[PDB]
């Protein structure tokens with residue numbers, strides 16, 4: 001039912017999001033019988049934050065997103081917002097953001113050492129490969145800042161001092177929508193089940209952004225054979241049954257990834273020996289700059305090799321949109337999205353859904 005449709009892979013045959021979609025099983029922490037007051041010193045909140053790497057110029061789009069996340073979820077639970085930026089935030093940014101939430105807002109700068117390219121990266125080599133990707137890649141002109149952002153999300157956010165006493169994060173981007181009321185504490189849902197990571201959307205990537213990522217990953221694994229987990233996602237990571245030309249073009253990696261603009265995650269996974277050694281290996285290989293390795297494929301590969309796949313969760317009940325893709329469940333808690341409609345735009349977008357592979361090789365849990 002959740003298998004691939006062919007006409008040429010053409011997306012999912014029958015989207016599970018069409019099924020009546022409710023809450024996960026087990027105990028859930030509710031706002032109506034706990035202390036989730038925004039300024040309570042004895043609240044039911046665990047050590048978690050809503051986080052966002054964002055620019056001053058994206059303020060209006062950030063505010064739209066905050067309104068959705070607050071209305072659907074955080075107005076009841078009042079977890080803090082922590083904003084990150086390589087540059088200082090304006091006073092207008094601080095005032096407008098704090099006005100949209102009863103929770104505490106924090107405003108952090110990314111340190112130069114977590115943002116600047118490392119000393120070993122040759123900037124002339126960067127510029128040469130960037131010019132080629134600019135020429136080849138659809139609706140894409142290269143920016144150094146994009147590479148710095150990918151590297152920051154891949155290896156640096158979990159090392160920021162502001163997050164030292166936090167264990168869980170919910171990553172948020174500007175200009176995204178949330179469609180469904182969520183009536184349980186998602187962070188304590190994660191914590192009580194020892195979950196590592198949560199996603200809403202699962203996509204193919206552009207192989208041109210990651211051609212040596214899998215080769216470099218295999219090198220890392222050969223040097224560290226004890227790191228591979230037993231409940232791993234090798235089948236999903238190496239799948240070639242849906243779009244074999246992607247897997248060939250990315251030299252053994254399917255290119256499928258959790259779409260990282262949305263993430264609910266355990267910071268201590270990424271801080272761990274295995275993942276962080278993987279990041280440092282990739283950092284020294286140079287592909288964050290000489291290629292355009294996204295944090296999504298890097299997170300996805302790291303999770304798929306080093307996490308317990310049983311501890312990765314599809315948040316099917318969180319209605320979500322970052323242009324042009326959707327996770328819209330069939331639930332009376334949702335409005336303003338079409339259940340099971342994966343994309344908005346041209347029909348060639350349908351083939352970008354990788355869930356039929358993920359659900360086959362890993363599952364729908």
Ligand SMILES: Nc1nc2c(ncn2[C@@H]2O[C@H](COP(=O)(O)OP(=O)(O)O)[C@@H](O)[C@H]2O)c(=O)[nH]1
Pocket residue numbers: 052053054055058084085086087145146149172173174261
């Ligand atoms: N502070 C800062 N944030 C950035 C920069 N580049 C990207 N971002 C943020 O990183 C996330 C991803 O960037 P975005 O432009 O949405 O890329 P896309 O979602 O892949 O198109 C968003 O939350 C952006 O606000 C940057 O140079 N500085």
Ligand SMILES: [Mn+2]
Pocket residue numbers: 173261322
């Ligand atoms: Mn974005």
Ligand code: NA
Pocket residue numbers: 031032033034035036037
């Ligand atoms: Na309450």
Ligand code: NA
Pocket residue numbers: 133134135136137138139140141
């Ligand atoms: Na281009």
